[PDB]
């Protein structure tokens, strides 16, 4: 239409590669945060962003397992710099019409001045890294211009895809959107012996949705626009309006809106991460006629490394979409051998229309993510994918002695919560229907009682954990909304999912009237791609999720939280501490 | 058949060549034992092994008769390392059917926990070598992580093929299987004067049979499996069961199951050693119709 960007007008780029490992461990690699001008699209003007080394995404850091590395994340954004991200909250639109976050522009609403007034204040978190809390990017310890955050990463972890981004307390949703994100690949001998496509044929893909502001006649102007929609104008408990997380109509891949990539008719490896604030990409690979393309994509790794077996992603009805929530990583082989001279598209699928078809109304006005243009060669790729991938993979057993956490996730309108969803840490009991008490009727048909002991980031510490121990964490989502939960430090495995009836939960009370009931005639199968190592799993509701993990290889104070950046900036986050068992004896 | 490897799917490799002779005899060549992942077959995942210089087979050492050589066989396998070889003993199975050592997997049986607890404890024996007992790899004198066994080999012996391998007291059967073997060639003027095929045309072949573990659905998982068969469950004299030696279904040549080798229509020299625990290979050269080929092989 008039005023729309043409998809696939510009080629894909990849961030420059950084290899920081050296003989001299005391010689840090400075990674300087600097303002930079970014061409999102040939049809836009340049866009002001903040980049690690002036690049968006940041450089792709590459290391080998065991190579000890030191990085100085160094704020070089001058005092007085314009804040790259304009922020607005806008009214709801007419019902049954596309929400305003399906559109650019502010619709008359004034940029929020308090965001405009943000100085550069940043802390970098290497998401997925096994490293002590002093290295982790703790949210309060963001630094201003001239100052550094120093991180050691021992990198004593199997080959995987990590990624790094701003984590500044309360403002992570803006800082990350400004451009502070990048990926970080660890290599090892096990991965090497797989003989995976590499060099030219290994492509990091950092995808993120954006919105843009518009000029006064409605022309897009390239300015980053964090636009949310108000679902409650005035919250009964507080003064304040209440808004949903960020979703935008434009999809960026490696810092470009809707790029194309020229590839050969061979095997390729994609290191995919969703770096979006909140959007879940339900990805489908489709051909010129919008037909999903089976038998071509294979998932081979996940957050924490190689899967035990490759998972076919055939966009059939065993896995119709590859669902990628914020912060999740997918190690994908795609096999273009039979596809020379073809053009294929990765698209976000809307719930209300086929893959490839706009569904503005399902939150996907523009399906396009990126295009592959496959050149016919006369070459023969004999790459072999084995049926078992990793010989190192050992399945997590519930038989290993472990401790237990229950984390309840609550509906937004819950009592005492100011209209926001929350993390509630729960402790079991051994004054029935009361505030902060939740009963649960388990599978075995019996009922336990739990009390709420923390509801927000700054409540007193709940989880203190001996280094080297295993713990099973249950996330019990009592709401209809999906929270991609993330735990710093550790690798976990998914043990089980169960559906619940949660209509026993009284929002106005903030407790159960009648118990939350496991619902055993709704099986929730595990996704076929979540049986490896994960550190950020999706938790729909009403449901419960069982993960297990070894808290291993480092110490300190760490975070777990929701990875919708808006919910994270609004209290949906908790600390935990990992100490030597021997220091645990002193409390 | 479903779940079977395709023979001849990957090319033969040869260990890298090592040439330790030097003008300063007091400068040892360090040969460090390390964990390594090796791809036995394209249809398998990578396999955990222990290798001399991270190589399985270890490097082909080459020396001339009279070149005095000192080697520090140096344990660099980190403490806490997973032991690479899984050990089980399984019951007989029905008479007139293939023995269980004919099949991959453990069947029901538990990995032996004592073998799984082994730390890396190795001593290296140069099999063939004429050198004093101090150098020969006495079996009790295995070394743990961070230490070395030092060996002088005067190499005063006519040209031949020797081979080297772990010789650790009581655990040799697992250590060698873990990957600790390689070959060692001595050259001299007499063999040189025969002008034998050399370079590209001399190929060491270290053959060894192996067994592998399976997952629950019975897929091969690349994990080294030392699986022996119980022939007497309770020996009258001792508490304990008695099992036969190791035999396994897969043949590796230079660390690859059933490789192929591209050669020219010319004379080749093969330096063949059987590094198996126990299997005696009864070797036949056959053609595409399975006919044995006469007039082609000569042992020298
Ligand atoms: Cu993290
Ligand atoms: Cu449990
Ligand atoms: Cu959330
Ligand atoms: Cu001997």
Q: Residue A407 maps to which CATH number?
A: 2.60.40.420
CA-to-CA distance for A355 and A357, rounded, in angstroms? Answer: 6
Residue A542: cis peptide before it, omega within 30 degrees of 0: yes
Q: Nominal resolution in Å?
A: 2.3
- Residues A386 and A407 grouped into a single domain: no
Q: Which of A66, A383, A388 to mutate to test the interface with B (most CBs of B within 10 A)?
A: A388
CA-to-CA distance for B153 and B300, rounded, in angstroms? Answer: 25
Q: Which residues contact A307 (CB under 8 A, 6 or more apart)?
A: A299, A300, A301, A331, A389, A390, A393, A529, A531, A532
Burial of B21 (0-12, 13-18, 19+ CB in 10 A): middle
CA-to-CA distance for A55 and A61, rounded, in angstroms? Answer: 13
- Residues A148 and A28 grouped into a single domain: yes
Residues B179 and B51 sit within 8 Å (Cβ to Cβ): yes
CA-to-CA distance for A137 and B200, rounded, in angstroms? Answer: 55
CA-to-CA distance for A397 and A67, rounded, in angstroms? Answer: 30
Q: How is residue B31 written in tokens?
A: 């040969």
CA-to-CA distance for A48 and A35, rounded, in angstroms? Answer: 7
Residue B57: cis peptide before it, omega within 30 degrees of 0: yes
Task: Tell me the three state secondary structure of residue B71.
Answer: strand
CA-to-CA distance for A241 and A231, rounded, in angstroms? Answer: 8
The domain boundary, picked from A328, A359, A391, lies at: A391
Task: Tell me the three state secondary structure of residue A117.
Answer: coil
Residues B207 and B279 sit within 8 Å (Cβ to Cβ): no
3-class SS string, A168-212: CCCCHHHHHHCCCEEEEEEECHHHHCCCCCCHHHEEEEEEEEECE
Q: How is residue A8 written in tokens?
A: 């696939």
Angle B220-B221-B222 (CA atoms, 0-180°, nearest 5)?
Answer: 105
Task: Tell me the three state secondary structure of residue A311.
Answer: strand
What H or E segment, with its residue span, contains residue A401? Answer: none
Task: Tell me the three state secondary structure of residue B223.
Answer: strand
CA-to-CA distance for A25 and B94, rounded, in angstroms? Answer: 62
Of A548, A486, A463, A462, the closest CA to residue A129 belongs to A486
In order, the DSSP letters of A481-542 are S-EEEEESS-EEEEEEEEEEE-TTEETTTTEESS-EEEEEEEE-PPPTT-SS-BSEEEE-SS
- Residues A138 and A15 grouped into a single domain: yes
Of B10, B37, B48, B4, the closest CA to residue B258 belongs to B10
Cα B250 off chain centre by: 13
Domain count, chain A: 3
Residue A235: cis peptide before it, omega within 30 degrees of 0: no
After which residue numbers is chain A interrupted with C–N beyond 2.5 angstroms? 430
Residues B56 and B49 sit within 8 Å (Cβ to Cβ): yes
- Residues A450 and A324 grouped into a single domain: no
- In sign, the C-alpha dihedral spanning A186, A59, A375, A316 is positive
Task: Tell me the three state secondary structure of residue A133.
Answer: helix
- Residues A173 and A201 grouped into a single domain: no
- Residues A334 and A409 grouped into a single domain: no
Q: What residues of B are in contact with residue A391 (Cβ under 8 Å)?
A: 37, 45-48, 221-223
Residues A409 and A422 sit within 8 Å (Cβ to Cβ): yes
Cβ of residue A158 closer than 8 Å to a chain B Cβ: no
Helix then strand count (H, E) for chain B reads 3, 17
CA-to-CA distance for B135 and B132, rounded, in angstroms? Answer: 6
Of B167, B194, B144, the closest CA to residue B300 belongs to B194
Angle A494-A499-A502 (CA atoms, 0-180°, nearest 5)?
Answer: 125
CA-to-CA distance for A340 and B14, rounded, in angstroms? Answer: 36
- Residues A459 and A494 grouped into a single domain: yes
CA-to-CA distance for A326 and A207, rounded, in angstroms? Answer: 9
**Residues spanned by the domain of A119:** 1-187
- For residue B143, the 8-state DSSP code is B
| Chain-chain contact of A388 with B215 (C-beta, under 8 angstroms) | yes
Q: Helices in A276-374 by DSSP H: which ranges?
A: none
Residues B20 and B196 sit within 8 Å (Cβ to Cβ): no
Residues A438 and A426 sit within 8 Å (Cβ to Cβ): yes
- Residues A367 and A496 grouped into a single domain: no
Q: What residues of A are in contact with residue B46 (Cβ under 8 Å)?
A: 189-190, 193-194, 390-391
How many residues belong to chain B? 300
Residues A547 and A304 sit within 8 Å (Cβ to Cβ): no
Q: What residues of A are in contact with residue B219 (Cβ under 8 Å)?
A: 387-388
Residue ranges with strand state E in A287-402: 297-302, 305-313, 322-324, 329-335, 343-348, 368-375
Q: How is residue B135 written in tokens?
A: 């150098």
CA-to-CA distance for A367 and A283, rounded, in angstroms? Answer: 9
CA-to-CA distance for A561 and A563, rounded, in angstroms? Answer: 6
Q: How is residue A227 written in tokens?
A: 């636009």
Angle A51-A52-A53 (CA atoms, 0-180°, nearest 5)?
Answer: 100
* Phi–psi pair at A385, nearest 5 degrees: -100, 115
Task: Tell me the three state secondary structure of residue B81.
Answer: coil
Angle A396-A397-A402 (CA atoms, 0-180°, nearest 5)?
Answer: 100
CB < 8 Å & 24+ apart, contacts of A92-99? A92/A229, A92/A230, A92/A231, A96/A361, A97/A361, A98/A360, A98/A361, A98/A365, A99/A229, A99/A363
Residue A2: count other Cβ atoms within 10 Å of its Cβ.
Answer: 4
Residues A12 and A373 sit within 8 Å (Cβ to Cβ): no
CB within 8 Å of chain A, chain B residues 183-222: 215, 219-222
Q: How is residue A80 written in tokens?
A: 């007085």
Residue in the structure block whose two tokens are 């300190």: A556
Residue A241: count other Cβ atoms within 10 Å of its Cβ.
Answer: 15
Residues A467 and A474 sit within 8 Å (Cβ to Cβ): no
- For residue B187, the 8-state DSSP code is E
Residue A226, CA atoms < 13 Å, CB-side half-sphere? 26
| Chain-chain contact of A384 with B42 (C-beta, under 8 angstroms) | yes
- Residues A47 and A173 grouped into a single domain: yes
Dmax over CA atoms of chain B, in Å, equals: 62
Residue in the structure block whose two tokens are 């927000």: A456
CA-to-CA distance for A486 and B138, rounded, in angstroms? Answer: 54
CA-to-CA distance for A162 and A206, rounded, in angstroms? Answer: 11
- Residues A182 and A193 grouped into a single domain: no
- In sign, the C-alpha dihedral spanning A371, A376, A377, A378 is positive
CA-to-CA distance for A468 and B172, rounded, in angstroms? Answer: 33
Q: How is residue B270 written in tokens?
A: 């093969």
- In sign, the C-alpha dihedral spanning A258, A356, A363, A499 is negative
* Phi–psi pair at A583, nearest 5 degrees: -90, -25
Of B54, B206, B40, B51, the closest CA to residue B127 belongs to B206
What H or E segment, with its residue span, contains residue A456? Answer: none
CA-to-CA distance for A72 and A134, rounded, in angstroms? Answer: 13
The domain boundary, picked from A129, A152, A187, lies at: A187
Burial of B297 (0-12, 13-18, 19+ CB in 10 A): exposed
- Residues A384 and A424 grouped into a single domain: no
Give A193 to chain B, closest Cα distance, Å: 6
Q: Which of B2, B37, B47, B217 to mutate to test the interface with A (most CBs of A within 10 A)?
A: B37
Of A184, A206, A216, A307, the closest CA to residue A255 belongs to A206
Burial of A113 (0-12, 13-18, 19+ CB in 10 A): exposed
3-state helix, strand and coil shares in percent for chain B, rounded to the nearest 5: 5, 35, 55
- Residues A245 and A365 grouped into a single domain: yes
Strands A329-335 and A267-274, bridge-based pairing: antiparallel
Angle A45-A46-A50 (CA atoms, 0-180°, nearest 5)?
Answer: 150
Cβ of residue A432 closer than 8 Å to a chain B Cβ: no
Q: How is residue B106 written in tokens?
A: 């453990």
Angle A26-A31-A36 (CA atoms, 0-180°, nearest 5)?
Answer: 165
Of A335, A357, A238, the closest CA to residue A289 belongs to A357
**In which region does residue A23 sit, left (phi positive, over 0), alpha (psi from -120 to 50) or beta (all else)?**
alpha
The domain boundary, picked from A139, A171, A187, lies at: A187
The C-alpha R_g of chain A, in whole angstroms, comes to 23
Quote the ligand 4 centre to B126 CA distance (angstroms).
7
């Amino acid at each position: 239409a008039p005023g729309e960007l043409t998809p696939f007008a510009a080629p894909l780029t990849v961030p420059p590669v950084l290899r920081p490992a050296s003989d001299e461990v005391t010689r840090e690699t400075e990674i300087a945060l600097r303002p930079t001008w970014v061409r999102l699209h040939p049809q836009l003007p340049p866009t002001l962003m903040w980049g690690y080394d002036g690049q968006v995404p940041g450089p792709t850091i590459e290391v080998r397992r065991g190579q000890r590395v030191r990085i100085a994340w160094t704020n070089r954004i001058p005092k007085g710099s314009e804040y790259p991200v304009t922020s607005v909250e806008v009214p709801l639109g007419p019902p049954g019409t596309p929400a305003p976050n399906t559109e650019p522009g502010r619709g008359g609403v004034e940029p929020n001045k308090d965001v405009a007034a943000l100085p550069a204040w940043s802390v970098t978190h290497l998401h997925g890294a096994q490293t002590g809390g002093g290295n982790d990017g703790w949210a309060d310890n963001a630094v201003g211009f001239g100052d550094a955050q120093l991180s050691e990463y021992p990198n004593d972890h199997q080959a995987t895809q990590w990624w790094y981004h701003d984590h500044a307390m309360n403002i992570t949703r803006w800082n990350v959107m400004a451009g502070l994100y990048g990926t970080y690949l660890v290599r090892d001998d096990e991965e090497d012996a797989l003989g995976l496509p590499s060099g030219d044929r290994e492509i990091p893909l950092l995808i993120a949705d954006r919105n843009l502001d518009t000029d006064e006649d409605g022309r897009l102007n390239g300015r980053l626009l964090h636009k949310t929609v108000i679902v409650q104008q005035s919250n009964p408990e507080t003064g304040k309006p209440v808004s949903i997380p960020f979703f935008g109509p434009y999809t960026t891949v490696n810092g470009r809106i809707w790029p194309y990539a020229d590839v050969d008719d061979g095997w390729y490896r994609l290191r995919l991460v969703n770096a979006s604030n909140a959007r879940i990409y339900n990805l489908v690979l489709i051909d010129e006629d919008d037909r999903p393309v089976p038998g071509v994509v294979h998932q081979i790794g996940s957050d924490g490394g190689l899967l035990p077996r490759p998972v076919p992603v055939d966009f059939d009805d065993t896995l119709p979409v590859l669902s990628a929530a914020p912060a999740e990583r997918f190690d994908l082989l795609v096999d273009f051998r039979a596809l020379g001279g073809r053009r294929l598209r990765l698209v976000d699928k809307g719930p209300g229309a086929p893959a490839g078809t706009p569904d503005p109304l399902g939150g996907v006005r523009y399906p396009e993510v990126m295009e592959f243009r496959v050149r016919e060669t006369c070459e023969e790729d004999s790459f072999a994918l084995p049926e078992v991938l990793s010989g190192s993979f050992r399945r997590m057993s519930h038989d290993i002695p472990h401790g237990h956490r229950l984390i309840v996730l609550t509906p937004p309108g819950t009592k005492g919560s100011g209209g926001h969803p929350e993390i509630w840490e729960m402790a079991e009991v051994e004054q029935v229907p009361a505030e902060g008490v939740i009963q649960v009727t388990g599978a075995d048909g019996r009922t336990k009682t739990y009390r709420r002991t923390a509801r927000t980031f700054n409540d007193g510490l709940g989880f203190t954990i001996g280094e080297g121990t295993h713990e099973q964490w249950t996330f019990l989502n009592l709401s209809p909304i999906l929270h991609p939960m993330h735990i710093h430090l550790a690798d976990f495995q998914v043990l089980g999912r169960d559906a619940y009836d949660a209509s026993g939960f009284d929002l106005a009370l903030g407790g159960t009237r009648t118990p939350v009931r496991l619902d055993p005639d709704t099986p929730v199968p595990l996704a076929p791609n979540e049986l490896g190592h994960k550190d950020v799993f999706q938790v729909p509701g009403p449901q419960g999720l069982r993960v297990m993990g070894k808290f291993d290889g480092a110490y300190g104070r760490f975070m777990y939280h929701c990875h919708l950046l808006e919910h994270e900036d609004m209290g949906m986050m908790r600390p935990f501490v990992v100490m030597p068992p021997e220091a645990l004896k002193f409390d």
